[PDB]
Design an enzyme around this catalytic site. Structure first.
Site, short mmCIF file in Angstrom:
data_model
loop_
_atom_site.label_atom_id
_atom_site.label_comp_id
_atom_site.label_asym_id
_atom_site.label_seq_id
_atom_site.Cartn_x
_atom_site.Cartn_y
_atom_site.Cartn_z
N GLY B 26 0.83 -1.20 0.00
CA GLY B 26 0.00 0.00 0.00
C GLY B 26 0.86 1.25 0.00
O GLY B 26 1.91 1.31 0.66
N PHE B 28 3.56 3.18 -1.30
CA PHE B 28 4.77 2.92 -2.06
C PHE B 28 5.45 1.61 -1.64
O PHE B 28 6.51 1.27 -2.15
CB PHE B 28 5.76 4.08 -1.88
CG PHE B 28 5.29 5.41 -2.45
CD1 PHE B 28 4.44 5.48 -3.56
CD2 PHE B 28 5.76 6.61 -1.90
CE1 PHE B 28 4.03 6.71 -4.09
CE2 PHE B 28 5.36 7.85 -2.42
CZ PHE B 28 4.50 7.90 -3.52
N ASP B 140 -4.00 10.19 11.28
CA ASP B 140 -4.63 9.19 10.45
C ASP B 140 -4.97 7.94 11.24
O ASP B 140 -4.77 6.82 10.77
CB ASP B 140 -3.70 8.85 9.30
CG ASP B 140 -4.39 8.07 8.21
OD1 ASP B 140 -3.66 7.37 7.48
OD2 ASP B 140 -5.65 8.13 8.11
N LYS B 142 -7.13 5.13 12.22
CA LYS B 142 -8.23 4.41 11.60
C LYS B 142 -8.10 2.91 11.90
O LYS B 142 -7.10 2.45 12.47
CB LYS B 142 -8.23 4.66 10.09
CG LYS B 142 -7.01 4.12 9.38
CD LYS B 142 -6.98 4.54 7.92
CE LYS B 142 -5.81 3.87 7.22
NZ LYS B 142 -5.72 4.15 5.77
N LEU B 143 -9.13 2.15 11.54
CA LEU B 143 -9.13 0.73 11.84
C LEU B 143 -7.88 0.06 11.29
O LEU B 143 -7.22 -0.71 11.98
CB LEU B 143 -10.40 0.08 11.29
CG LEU B 143 -11.61 -0.03 12.24
CD1 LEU B 143 -11.58 0.94 13.40
CD2 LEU B 143 -12.92 0.11 11.48
N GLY B 144 -7.54 0.38 10.05
CA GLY B 144 -6.39 -0.22 9.39
C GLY B 144 -5.04 0.05 10.01
O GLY B 144 -4.10 -0.70 9.75
#
Ligand SMILES: CC[C@@H]1C(=O)N(C)c2cnc(Nc3ccc(C(=O)N[C@H]4CC[C@H](N5CCN(CC6CC6)CC5)CC4)cc3OC)nc2N1C(C)C
Ligand SMILES: CC[C@@H]1C(=O)N(C)c2cnc(Nc3ccc(C(=O)N[C@H]4CC[C@H](N5CCN(CC6CC6)CC5)CC4)cc3OC)nc2N1C(C)C
Ligand SMILES: [Zn+2]
Ligand SMILES: [Zn+2]
EC number: 2.7.11.21
Lengths: 293, 293
Positions: B26, B28, B140, B142-144
């Protein structure tokens, strides 16, 4: 993978196009020269595989682009000659522009001469006048979308961010996509309309005359900040009449800019030399516009 | 192409890592399990080819991510174990999180039970308390980016959008990147700071409890418009104490939200059951927290 067919058939029109050489790819599309096997006349084919159109939103954007573009016919707009699909691909048949775009010109020439800027800017404005009177906002006018045919005539293309204005005073609240020459009312998300394209033309004129875009930095968000702050400057060697017109177009308040219909009446146009055409050498060498035979 | 080596050597530390199985890619980066050939202990390797780091801006973002992350050590932050490079690649050595992230959990479980939400939210908040007291804004969350180890402990990762606050009251004006749970002060570009992460935690809590994110639409810019308008709703089946805390966090005015240090003192935490741990089955089946042996 999924392979793109060598011959493209439209069952409604009964037409067959032989797939020629590769022109480039961007977004979701691969592009090729395509010749009508019967008539032999050559087109630009934009081929987008349905495997990248799995979401209704992405399909709807495609449908809209086509809907907007198919209803347009003007000397300085890219001719739309058809579209069709099979189970794997959507194919769009566009006017081939053998001299590519103003992007490639700029890369090669940087700042143009004033008369050249005038020549291109007039055709850009005329194309846009047509759009705006048919209630279409392009919303992504840039060097790369301003194609040139064999006679160095400008053809506005890529209606992938275009929108129709459906009622008087409608303010678009949303723009899905990231334009190059993006207006301040968009960036702040305060609502926007036709003035967005005049802003882009101001940027284009700056770029054509100066040889670099007005808000360039090494960071995109830094650039958006400059645009928010109206932080550009016009070099002193730019002529005052040109500089004035750029400043009118590149203004934070959308309602303070000129409308597309006013532009060709600006002194920049009416009191400067506008060549009737440009020789092919203008792709490469600056023209001096001699009066000599 | 350019091939990634099967064994990675760090000349300073004198360390060798055998490249194991592929974890995903994801931005680069391509990612693999990597084991220290000597110590045999296993890591997550993030490998980014320098061919995609040709611009100074993209190199500087990488350098910053590393600089921020290398200086962090906390129970609920992803362990940073090293980095190094050759002529073709940058290699980052991170704590392996064998249970992937809360993204994969959510996909499988949708809305969690209240005690589970509490359990994860507490560790998320603790991780973020650590960040904020060291003047780091993640930007940033977030769940990920919320990884889970073997014992279902949360580890905050991906510092690719993180920034250091260098002076008291500094308002960041720029965010290069597109967060998932993006706060309204960012979208309007009016300046932002620590409160941005509390907003994201509010979104995360909504998502964990409701089973969908609060501003979801089929269009990203449409979503940003909802967030601008504070246009979400909390379903009636959500308990009032949870609903209240979500509403405090998901507020347009940044200064009206709680600070990260207040959160664990909210009634949502202090008057509800917080399991001390979760069994592995919680990846798959909802737990009922029986008192039975
Ligand atoms: C169709 C969509 C849009 C549109 O809407 N309209 C209306 C449109 C109309 N007309 C055109 N024309 C042409 C576009 C392009 C060319 C070209 O030479 N392309 C070349 C570019 C460089 C590629 N090279 C780079 C170096 N690589 C080698 C490596 C080491 C560096 C090898 C590969 C090879 C292909 C020629 C055209 O005309 C003959 N394009 C249009 N486009 C798009 C193509 C942008
Ligand atoms: C390194 C950067 C970041 C980070 O910063 N930290 C700290 C971190 C820490 N720990 C991990 N762990 C794992 C991540 C992932 C896995 C996995 O199973 N991945 C599989 C995903 C699906 C792939 N499949 C899909 C279906 N395909 C078949 C086709 C038909 C459908 C075939 C290919 C195969 C690989 C396992 C992990 O643990 C064992 N990842 C981290 N990441 C990233 C990976 C996001
Ligand atoms: Zn940037
Ligand atoms: Zn969209």
């Amino acid at each position: 993978a999924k392979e793109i067919p060598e011959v493209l058939v439209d069952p409604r029109s009964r037409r067959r196009y032989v797939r020629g050489r590769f022109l480039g790819k961007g977004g979701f599309a691969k592009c090729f020269e395509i010749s009508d096997a019967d008539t032999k006349e050559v087109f630009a084919g934009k081929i987008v595989p349905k495997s990248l159109l799995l979401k209704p939103h992405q399909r709807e954007k495609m449908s809209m682009e086509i809907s907007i573009h198919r209803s347009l016919a003007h000397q300085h707009v890219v001719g739309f000659h058809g579209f069709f699909e099979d189970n794997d691909f959507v194919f769009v048949v566009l006017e081939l522009c053998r001299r590519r775009s103003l992007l490639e010109l700029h890369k090669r020439r940087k700042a143009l001469t004033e008369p050249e800027a005038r020549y291109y800017l007039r055709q850009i404005v005329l194309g846009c006048q047509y759009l705006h009177r048919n209630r279409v906002i392009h919303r992504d006018l840039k060097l790369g979308n301003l194609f040139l045919n064999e006679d160095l005539e400008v053809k506005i293309g890529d209606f992938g961010l275009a929108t129709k204005v459906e009622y008087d005073g409608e303010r678009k609240k949303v723009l899905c996509g990231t334009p190059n020459y993006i207006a301040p009312e968009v960036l702040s998300k305060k609502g926007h309309s036709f003035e967005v394209d005049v802003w882009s033309i101001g940027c284009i004129m700056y770029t054509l005359l100066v040889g670099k875009p007005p808000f360039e930095t090494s960071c995109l968000k830094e650039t958006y900040l400059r645009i928010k702050k109206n932080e550009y400057s016009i070099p002193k060697h730019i002529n005052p009449v040109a500089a004035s017109l750029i400043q009118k177009m590149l203004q934070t308040d959308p309602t303070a800019r000129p409308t597309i219909n006013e532009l060709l009446n600006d002194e920049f146009f009416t009191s400067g030399y506008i060549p009737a055409r440009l020789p092919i050498t203008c792709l490469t060498i600056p023209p001096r516009f001699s009066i000599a035979p």
